[PDB]
Amino acid sequence: WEESYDLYSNIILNSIDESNGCVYYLSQINRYRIYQSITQAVTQFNGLGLLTFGRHYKPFTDEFLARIEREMTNFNIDDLFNGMPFEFQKKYKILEFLSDNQFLYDDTVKLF
Amino acid sequence: WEESYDLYSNIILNSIDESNGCVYYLSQINRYRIYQSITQAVTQFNGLGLLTFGRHYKPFTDEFLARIEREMTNFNIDDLFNGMPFEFQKKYKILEFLSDNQFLYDDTVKLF
Incomplete structure (x- = not known):
């Protein structure tokens, strides 16, 4: 988890130069989730x-x-x-x- | 429902001049919901x-x-x-x- 967080911190800095920043959004979400994982x-x-x-x-x-x-x-x-x-x-x-x-969860209401 | 729609419209017309619009906002929401209900x-x-x-x-x-x-x-x-x-x-x-x-869609989350 250590080096993965480090790599995400690198990619978020490096991604701004290019366009279509879907990578930036996904990296942000992944970083927040891995923060949750480390804290838990x-x-x-x-x-x-x-x-x-x-x-x-x-x-x-x-x-x-x-x-x-x-x-x-x-x-x-x-x-x-x-x-x-x-x-x-x-x-x-x-x-x-x-x-x-x-x-x-939009799916789970279907399952129930 | 037909009378309720007219009353909501009258309330919206009357209360737009007054102070904080909790009544105005909730009346707008109720009017739109009644419109959905009458159409359906x-x-x-x-x-x-x-x-x-x-x-x-x-x-x-x-x-x-x-x-x-x-x-x-x-x-x-x-x-x-x-x-x-x-x-x-x-x-x-x-x-x-x-x-x-x-x-x-934040409580059916917890039913699981």
């Missing part, structure tokens, strides 16, 4: 402690935790699609439910 | 014909049907909350979900 993990890893892997094993260090916590405690996922240019909003109206959760 | 009712009534209640029941007159079509031309509702005054947007962001026709 660190909640239970040290929460259960040594018994979890027979050792007080901390996969991540304070460097990554502090850096990301200071970095993306400025992000609202709802503003992301509304802040993108008008052309992106018109052409890619599809890639809006991904930011929220609703897309997995 | 008339389509099924005049589609199924006499077979519905064993009688060729024509509930409403052509006056209302002709009037609402001219009054409800276009009228995209997705920008109703965006066109309201800035003070209303700051104060009453809370009711922003009413306009969107997906408001309950």
